Design a protein around this nucleic acid. Structure first.
Length: 40
RNA sequence: GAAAGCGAGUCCGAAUAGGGCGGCAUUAGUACGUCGGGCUAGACUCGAAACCAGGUGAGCUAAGCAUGACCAGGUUGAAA
């Protein structure tokens, strides 16, 4: 499976479809505008 | 990180000392080739004494069995 990690900092609206993400990765996509969709 | 796992953080720990990593001030790989070296094969070439497998030999020699052959001449003089 995939994973999102907080390294880049430009801020933009993005909708991510990863299988998991780090605390500061989710709390970075939302703060910049956008949703992170993790399955059931 | 032993792992679960967490993630530019993570591991010991009960939070503060530190290991390893990131940013590093910071630069990049991958495929094929030729060459250096490594590993694995007989591994630069040549050489054992030996160990193991299957077979060949008793026409030599050691013996055994079957059936044949051989021992001039002279001396001594047992029992009965």
């Amino acid at each position: 499976p995939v994973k999102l990690l907080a390294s880049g900092e430009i801020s933009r609206a993005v909708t991510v479809h990863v299988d998991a993400a780090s605390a500061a990765a989710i709390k970075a996509v939302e703060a910049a505008g956008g949703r992170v969709v993790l399955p059931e």
